Amino acid sequence: DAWAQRLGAFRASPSAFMAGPEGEDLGRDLLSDLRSEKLSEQTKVSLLALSMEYPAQLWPDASAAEVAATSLLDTLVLLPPRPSALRRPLLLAATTALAAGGALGPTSGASCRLLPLLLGLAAGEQRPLQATACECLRELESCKPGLLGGSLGLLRGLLGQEGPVQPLSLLLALALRNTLVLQSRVGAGLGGLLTWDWTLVEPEEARELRAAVIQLLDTSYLLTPVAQAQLLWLLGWALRGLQPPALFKPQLVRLLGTAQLTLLHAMLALKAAFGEALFTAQDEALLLRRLTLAAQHPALPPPTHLFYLHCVLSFPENWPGPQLCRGLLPSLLHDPMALLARLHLLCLLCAEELPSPRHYLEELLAGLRQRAALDGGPRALATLCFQASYLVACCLAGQPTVLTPLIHGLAQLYQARPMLAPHFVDLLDQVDSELREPLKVVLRQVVVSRPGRDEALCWHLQMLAKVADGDAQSATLNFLQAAAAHCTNWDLQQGLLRVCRALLRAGVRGGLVDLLQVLARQLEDPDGRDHARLYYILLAHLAAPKLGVAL
Amino acid sequence: ALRAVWLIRHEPGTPLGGTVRFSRRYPTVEKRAKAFNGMTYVPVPEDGPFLRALLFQLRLLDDDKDFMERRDGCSRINKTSIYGLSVGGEELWPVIAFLRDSMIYASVPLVEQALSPRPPLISISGVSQGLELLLGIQDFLYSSDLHTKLSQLPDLLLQACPLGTLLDANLQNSLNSINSVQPQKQPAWKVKAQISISITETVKCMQYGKQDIADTWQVAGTVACKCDLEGVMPAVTISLSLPTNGSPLQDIIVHPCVTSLDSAILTSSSSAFSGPYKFPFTPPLESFNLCHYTSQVPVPPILGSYHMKEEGVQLKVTVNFKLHESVRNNFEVCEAHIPFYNRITHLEYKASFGQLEVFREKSLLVWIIGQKFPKSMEISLSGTLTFGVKGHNKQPFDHICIGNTAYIKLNFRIADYTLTGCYADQHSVQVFASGKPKISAYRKLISSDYYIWNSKAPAPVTYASLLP
């Protein structure tokens, strides 16, 4: 329990404890007992794991980072010459401290001592050490561009020699990209780079690069899917503008016969970056079919389904039929969050208007409404209905044929389930005017249709406030007058004056001098009555613009 | 390149919501995020605030709130599992998550461009990378050992994701490489030819049974194999012998380790030959799946019906089944469970075969048909189920079952008889190597979703079912 209680307070909160009194010397102790012998294997392992995990919290300044770098390097060299388990973690922790401290640079002794060490070690627990060193070198090269562009000839020559496929492959690819970009930015090329410089921080090449790409592809057969995806993504970045892609065409075509979440995205971004150079006019069709298939294939988890359902909608075109729209069209066998990924397809199909797609949309939205009206269910159902309504409204503002049933269904749904007041308010606050107005009219008609004796008044008044205007005066005034007697709690007594304030803003003048008057004279809470008095005075004594400027 | 990884077990009722079992942050990538993003940078919070925000956004922490416009809004639509967290007045983006068997998985990747316009998700590689790592962890932890699996995880993934960049997504391989210590291009996920192909064709069928409405059945199948043979490059591609009565393969997708899929597999979506099944693979230390197939057969295996005349409190479920002759008459568990959503006090039943044991809750009488149907191939239940005080919330509330609409949930299973016709063959082994394939093939049948849909009531319908 020498260091366990020490690291507990840090891994509870790094920035909080490092801002405390004891954390001032925590890094000092940790660097001190690095070469000690009183610390067991487990304590050293745990301390070095923390040194891995948060290099930004104990050595902020560049000078402190350099000092810690030299200290770690010393205790790594000065280790006992016996097989132990501090070899790789020490190098990786020093790399983390130097890279995240900002003290790395060619003009510093710590970096000039660390970099040759990692280069030699990775050049070749020997295999795990080599892998760890290669990863450290690649990460350092990522931190400062070109930092590790020194031994490219070594890896080129020793590709068949010792060294794990994945680390050297990734490091070589990253170095190629960074070095070639920098040198072509200068104006020159590789200049013999195929055979530890620090100056990069500030024809034959085609054949050499073709050899590089074939070697990378050949060695990539061992690459795991995730690393394979990043390799191909950055390669498709690099060689888009800078030999035909028919070298990598067989591999890409073969990999598109898969459905793994990473190779599919590698193929998708490869086509979205390379554009229409390699894509055929019909290969886009097969890719679209497979993405749509994978958007609903039972053998895959929900996340993969929804990922490809988002990919298909924003699919990247090469040179900007109905059956594909029938392999993904929504149903009511779909879990709540997998329909809205499919509603755009149905809105697209029905916009240009087998049962009539409007009829199927009516049945689907009617099922969603019937789910929503079920009292005693979760809120996911109502959220589904309203998000679907928003998507169709934005997508189909311009066809009253499909929209009149939607408006009628929403009105009936409000009549059935008054507890959904906030959802309608948000929808009204988002949708455009072409749908804001008729829905406003119909929902006002629904709310003022009842005499006003319901127990859902606290849910009616919210819509009444969110919709009241100067179109239908007398009906609204009658409904509000009836509802005045059914307000006993402060919540409804504020929704009601929210309605009156909405009328205020609209500009209605006559009769309101009595509606607001009666509300102010016949409510329960004093605060609502004073609210009404103020708003009635504002409407009665203001000119039209000054109310918008002084109320 | 991620920024951090998580694994939070779902703990209902606890105010914190769970106890993190894994929280590794890579600060090299955070400095990279500063350098790349610039003015749009938003830092990664600590464990506590992250857990609070993620459980809030995943709708898993106290969903009883009336309306939170930051979550339930009509303008914030989440059509993908890549959510955007809002921590410390900053919109963290992108944050990944999914749930299965009470185990959350999460990650925040790196985007190498500014966030002032939210870049399209068809471009960020990190979303795919985070999702795949999370799926690999999910497969590892609940593969089949209660805490010896979750204890070694921090010492497990470090060997796979040391400094923010993944190496291999199979955590079983991290266990193989850490606990146990390649001069050729041996695959980076590998540390007497015996193969255990466990094919499994689940018959889900909303049989319905109307005139214009089609009877919706579809069988979901898969093949789990392994070329777990010694040698340098042994070759064992197995053949599955669907008969002449059986259709060719249907709905083929393959494994990440799998090489490719045929142009017909790309075409035949929802060569068309029964052979020779030549499936290229790459011998894994994992279990390679050369394909997952959902075969079609025109003959439904079981047919059913259901009427519930709501004569007050008399849910007379005059059921009537029809066991197609192609189905072997020996069912391991043909429990024709009959849940009673939205509704047994008085089991005044008339069971033709097998007990109809009302369960102790007296809410859903799971009528165990048992093991085999009678010689009449028809059960029935004219039960005067005189239910007492109307349960409005106690009963299982299933929205896909309202009113006189419902269906019998037959949880029926069968050993080695499915609806497709899989039969792996070994005498036709053709390869560029030599060996003895011990192809321990198999099959099964499960009730994925076998709702014998009541034709005396409306049923939800898919798209093509109404299509003539």
Side-chain angles (χ1 to χ4, degrees), chain A residues 487-491 493-497 499-500 502-504 506-508 510-515 517-520 522-523:
Chain A
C487 307
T488 317
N489 59 329
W490 210 78
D491 199 300
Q493 311 210 142
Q494 289 325 101
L496 200 65
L497 294 301
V499 189
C500 272
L503 272 172
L504 256 299
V508 176
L512 224 56
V513 314
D514 203 1
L515 177 75
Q517 198 159 10
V518 166
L519 276 205
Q522 278 165 359
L523 266 182

Side-chain angles (χ1 to χ4, degrees), chain B residues 76-89 92-99 102 104-121 123-137 140 142 145 148-149 152-154 157-158 160-176 183 187-191 193-195 197-203 207 209-210 213-214 217-222 224 227 231 234-235 237-243 246 248-249 252-257 262 264 268-272 274-277 279-284 288-289 291-293 296-298 300-307 312-313 319 321 323-325 328-337 339-341 343-344 347 349 351-354 358-359:
Chain B
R76 332 172 179 281
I77 309 193
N78 264 297
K79 338 169 305 312
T80 326
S81 280
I82 316 306
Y83 305 70
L85 261 70
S86 77
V87 52
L92 185 48
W93 199 81
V95 179
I96 311 161
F98 63 76
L99 179 140
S102 297
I104 296 178
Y105 303 87
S107 84
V108 187
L110 175 81
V111 49
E112 281 147 310
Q113 39 184 110
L115 291 63
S116 181
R118 312 281 269 291
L121 284 171
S123 42
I124 327 171
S125 65
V127 152
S128 184
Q129 271 107 37
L131 220 60
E132 172 36 30
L133 171 73
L134 271 41
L135 276 173
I137 299 170
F140 156 76
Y142 292 178
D145 267 327
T148 166
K149 268 167 181 184
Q152 51 180 312
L153 199 84
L157 180 78
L158 191 153
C161 185
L163 275 177
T165 297
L166 302 62
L167 303 170
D168 173 81
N170 203 317
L171 278 199
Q172 167 160 43
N173 219 320
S174 91
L175 265 64
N176 294 345
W189 26 247
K190 184 177 249 166
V191 167
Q194 59 178 356
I195 317 164
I197 307 99
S198 178
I199 312 113
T200 295
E201 267 72 350
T202 82
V203 186
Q207 291 278 283
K210 286 285 158 80
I213 308 176
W217 74 84
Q218 199 34 238
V219 162
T222 188
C227 280
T237 293
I238 325 160
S239 195
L240 309 154
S241 53
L242 275 164
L249 314 175
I252 297 287
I253 77 164
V254 316
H255 194 257
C257 88
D262 178 293
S268 58
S269 171
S270 176
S271 58
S274 161
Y277 285 167
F279 267 72
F281 58 80
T282 296
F288 86 103
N289 308 339
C291 94
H292 299 197
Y293 52 115
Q296 83 277 11
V297 163
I302 293 180
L303 290 142
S305 84
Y306 181 103
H307 323 86
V313 201
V319 306
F321 294 29
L323 198 155
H324 186 281
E325 56 91 14
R328 196 262 322 272
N329 202 323
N330 188 359
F331 300 148
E332 306 220 340
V333 173
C334 215
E335 178 166 298
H337 199 317
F340 285 122
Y341 317 127
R343 305 152 200 139
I344 298 187
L347 59 163
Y349 68 91
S352 170
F353 194 91
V358 165
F359 270 72

Side-chain angles (χ1 to χ4, degrees), chain A residues 135 138-139 221 224 230 233 257 260-262 265 290 293 297 306 310 360 379 387 423 426, chain B residues 1 27-28 32 67 74 79-80 124 128-129 132 163 165 167 188 256 282 462:
Chain A
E135 193 273 336
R138 174 201 150 261
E139 190 63 49
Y221 206 94
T224 79
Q230 278 152 3
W233 197 77
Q260 170 52 49
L261 198 51
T262 46
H265 203 169
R290 277 296 195 74
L293 169 142
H297 193 175
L306 275 92
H310 177 102
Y360 191 18
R379 203 164 292 276
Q387 268 149 1
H423 289 93
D426 211 306
Chain B
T28 323
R32 294 251 291 290
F67 200 68
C74 72
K79 338 169 305 312
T80 326
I124 327 171
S128 184
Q129 271 107 37
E132 172 36 30
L163 275 177
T165 297
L167 303 170
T282 296
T462 165

